[PDB]
Amino acid sequence: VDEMAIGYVCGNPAVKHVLTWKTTDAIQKPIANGDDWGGVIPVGMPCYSKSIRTTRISATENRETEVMDAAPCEYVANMFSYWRATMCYRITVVKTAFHTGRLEIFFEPGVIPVKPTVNNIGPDQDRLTGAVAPSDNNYKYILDLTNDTEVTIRVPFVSNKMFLKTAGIYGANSENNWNFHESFSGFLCIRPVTKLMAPDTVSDNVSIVVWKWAEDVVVVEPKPLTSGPTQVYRPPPTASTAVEVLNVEL
Amino acid sequence: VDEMAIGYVCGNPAVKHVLTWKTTDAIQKPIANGDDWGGVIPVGMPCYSK
Amino acid sequence: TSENPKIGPISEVASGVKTTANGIERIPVIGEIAKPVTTAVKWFADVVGTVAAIFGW
Amino acid sequence: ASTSDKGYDSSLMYFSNTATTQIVARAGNDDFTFGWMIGPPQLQGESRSVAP
Amino acid sequence: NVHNTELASSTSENSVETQEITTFHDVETPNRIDTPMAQDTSSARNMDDTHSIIQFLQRPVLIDNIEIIAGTTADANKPLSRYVLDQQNSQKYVRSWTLPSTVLRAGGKAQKLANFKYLRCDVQVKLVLNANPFVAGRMYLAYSPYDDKVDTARSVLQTSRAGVTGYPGVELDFQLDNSVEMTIPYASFQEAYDLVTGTEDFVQLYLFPITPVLGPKSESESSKVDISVYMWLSNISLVIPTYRINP
Amino acid sequence: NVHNTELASSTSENSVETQEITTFHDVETPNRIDTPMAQDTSSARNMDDTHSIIQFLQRPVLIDNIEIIAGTTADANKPLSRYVLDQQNSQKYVRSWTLPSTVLRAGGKAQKLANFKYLRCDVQVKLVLNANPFVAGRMYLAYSPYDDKVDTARSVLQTSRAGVTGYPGVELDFQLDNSVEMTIPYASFQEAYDLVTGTEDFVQLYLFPITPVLGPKSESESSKVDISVYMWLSNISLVIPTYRINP
Amino acid sequence: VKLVLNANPFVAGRMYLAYSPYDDKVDTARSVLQTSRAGVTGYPGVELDFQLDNSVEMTIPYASFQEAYDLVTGTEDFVQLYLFPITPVLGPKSESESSKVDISVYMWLSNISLVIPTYRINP
Amino acid sequence: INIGNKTNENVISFFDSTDAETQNHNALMKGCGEFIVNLRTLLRTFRTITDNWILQANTKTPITDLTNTTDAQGRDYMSYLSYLYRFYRGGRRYKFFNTTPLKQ
Predict the structure, then answer these.
(1) Cα(F169)–Cα(E227) distance, rounded to whole angstroms?
(2) Subcellular localization, per the record (chain B) (predicted)?
(3) Are F113 and F104 in contact (CB under 8 A)?
(4) Cβ E208 vs Cβ E142: under 8 Å
(5) I want to staple F6 with a disulfide (CB 3.0 to 4.6 A). Which of A11, F33, F55, H53 is the partner?
(6) Nearest in space to G60 (alpha carbons), one of G22, G102, G101, G114
């Protein structure tokens, strides 16, 4: 099989979220337990989540470093400047035969409700409750969890732009967040319709595992849109040690 | 639909008994818990409970 | 059969397979380029074959 | 990163009579390809060197 | 002929022209400037289509979200009494929904039938139920037209158990059907439903417990029912334009 | 079979059912109760039809009502200057109208494209003029796309009389055409016009006096012009559903 | 490779069985144990849900750069096979009853060619 | 409504607009003018791996004194795409642009 076609490389799924939907969580409120970004999945080929490694240069200075978990479609879009693709998702619930509930997955296009921190961007679950953000007009799927487990969602490319940026979470913070919003055009939001109904002889948790890949992928420009070069993060041996810093001067 | 035919009016079902069959009740004994008339339903079109 | 005001455009091309080039369908590799062990690679074709240039003449 | 079997394929050696300084730019030839796909590693962002 | 402009032309004495509501006598035909050969704009026609106004009103919306913990000392777990001897011992219900005035307010359907006057609709209703397999129970979803209009003895809350369940309804067994649907017709004596100057609560929708919620006696584990309600309209006709809208 | 009710049925494991936006997995197919033979309601279908949502947006609305009394010491009677030597001597205009953000706000069109995201439109414009036969004058209705976006030297208000009237426009002679029409295309660089999160004042519409209002010198009789403006949309595509709307 | 899984119906969980060729040969940053969750599960693998599939099978090809695998004079650890937990084991909180997973592993060979006779065998 | 987890995956596609392979081809006639299908073709474009490779006079230097440093970085396409794959095959090309303050 031609293992280098953009179809074949981006059609490799990868797990972006493993959520935790408790029996205590409220209805019409996005599932935010465990992982960052909660039950808010930005629909898009670039990467949206990053960790920050902080080490010491001196006693009065810290050197930060942004580390990004890449899916095999998010790793290819970083090579290019603009993207356009039909994004596919497979939302899978890890449960027994005795956990029953209902789950809502709606698509909301445009700007994502986010909390810009001083060094990173997180979502805003306060603006996605059932009161302030009704899902009565969105495209939604109401998954039943009495027997059924999986659902595959194919979100096409909808925007007012012919292509979206591939910058994503690179260098995104409070001081700079424009290129983050212009990279996705939408977000899936996972909220419970019915609270998780479970007996006492089973666990009080289920897990929602979200796979991610892409179809019908076109890309534009063979230059990365990021400020620095594409650099693979080589993990250091000890937490105190440092990393490689690639320059930009010629 | 002709909503006044005796077929159509009498063919409207209604709940006459909601019984309660416990795990303590004996076998071969009619289920008499909760409602009156127990597990004895008089077969007939008229009314039997008042 | 291609609209271009430059006389012959570039790098004369061979042929391939019947599918869409992206959008997953498991593209076979042997079908893409058409050079198996045969009279189609020019160095095995020169000795199958046996032209005068493989002998230094 | 294979075993102690070394020198099993060819490479390049550079030579110059003067102390030079260059811009090296590589690519594969008409037969170069990768294969046998695995999953990606992580990526690296900026390095701000924050004040605290 | 000239480009990118228009002049005074003195054309014919015609063009009573109609923009679907508005006409527009215009003693002579007005001189038109337009795009000379139109190739208009972006690909909004390739994203989706479209929608119309009676296709906006067919969208389901959340209306209520019931939760029943058994329990219960409360009233929604109290089942249908066999008799009603007086009006202070009426039939207890889980939840009521007046119609169509609940579904018109909710989900932004109020904007898309403002500046109209009359309406036909069938209020489609879908319940969604979800309980664990160790909890049993049965409920009944009847609707009573003109229930808050008629004399008290003609209501659904003032009749026996065998009379309540004689209304148009559907069973909701907890372990046989997690969802029921129901079409409630155009329940109005007059022609098309008046949207302006009046709330016209025509049909009431009730949800009754036949049996109580049959959960295990192990407390601190919350045997639970957790019903959800979806409603939308169908067979829609929305006709006469006005400038008014009700407070 | 029974009448006027439904029971628990235990049907097949199917019916991923779509109400045009919402689906609705439903582990088994929900049991339906409905009108057994529908003959629904009143004659709302015989009064009018219907309308749709891109047929609501094609209705003309009043936007402005100009009156010019000549006169005049004021600015709307001051005609186009032959030159502009500095930015404090710009071209004076009767009235400006930013687009499409004027026509979307007015006439209740804001409700019928709330809860959508993208839009195509052509802003149709019709002027209505009415003066007595003893008053002459000529006006010009040009539109300048990105007029409040571009550099100041690229504007319509910062160019000569021969440059202003080189824009796409139409003459409005007081005694030859009492009404002019004009189609303003989809004037946006991006694909379909973003309705949520941003005012996007793309094309400006101006009304210039070429000649001053040529009325008689008899005062206390009010030589007068009295222009009225009508606008509506055309070639409409309204696609992606959201839950948000701009402040 | 065939895994065999067997848990009671009151225990849920999901696992992933990826294999990394030359995992103990390559540079440390090119390993499977030194990458993210979205990078681990980008390897060739299979889900092992506790309540959907009690057995998974997997064919691992001839993963060697050279021609036929040398049996004499050398251990040649070419492909590593790992078993990762995606989700933790979701058992009830009732102790002294042992919620449990109990996996078993079966392996065998296929497409076999065994050619040249020698007199030696490795220690 | 029996007890037991199940299968039968429900592929749903939002936004019934137009088949996407028509929309992509119509979007690259207006924004690119080129259609990058395969990642193999990015291994044939020369990308610079260094900007100042300083050497000494009369010294035979292998490229594996440079390539062994820059394979780990992932800057160019042959070292960024190599992290997705485990094998390779075929020759390599090089270009050596001079930046020396030469003497006459």
Answers:
(1) 61
(2) Virion
(3) yes
(4) yes
(5) F33
(6) G22
Helix (H, G, I), strand (E, B) or coil at E62: strand
| Closest residue in H to A80 (Cα–Cα) | H36
Chain A residues whose CB is inside 8 A of the C23 CB are: 7, 215-217
Cis amide prior to F166 (ω within 30 degrees):
no
Task: Write down the experimental method used for this entry.
Answer: cryo-EM
Phi, psi of B38 (to 5 degrees): 50, -140
Residues of F in contact with E170 (CB under 8 A): 5-7, 31, 33
DSSP annotation of H55: -
Return the half-sphere exposure (C-beta side, CA atoms, 13 A cut-off) of residue G48.
Answer: 28
In this structure, which amino acid lies at residue A193? V
User: For residue H48, which phi and psi values (nearest 5 degrees)?
Assistant: -75, 130
Contact A136 E178 (CB under 8 A): no
Structure tokens at H24: 């992509």
Using alpha carbons, select from F229, F222, F215, F216 the residue that is nearest to residue F137: F215
**Type of residue found at G102:** D
- Rg (alpha carbons) of chain G, rounded to whole number: 18
What is the C-alpha separation between G54 and E115, in angstroms, rounded?
A: 61
Of chain C, the end-to-end C-alpha distance in Å amounts to: 41
CA E74 to chain CA centroid, nearest Å: 29
For residues A8 and C36, is the Cβ–Cβ distance under 8 A? no
Three-class SS of residue G7?
coil
Chain F residues in contact with A151 by the CB 8 A cut-off are 25
Amino acid identity at H39: L
Instruction: State the DSSP H helix or E strand holding residue F45, giving kind and residue range, or none if neither.
Output: helix F44-47
> For residues A217, A220, A225 and A230, what is the CA-based torsion angle, rounded to 10 degrees?
60
Q: Would you say F196 and E31 are in contact if contact means Cβ atoms under 8 Å apart?
A: no
Q: Are D40 and H83 in contact (CB under 8 A)?
A: yes
Structure tokens at H46: 């020369």
Give the Cα separation of E57 and E121 in Å (integer).
10
Residue with tokens 């001839």: G62
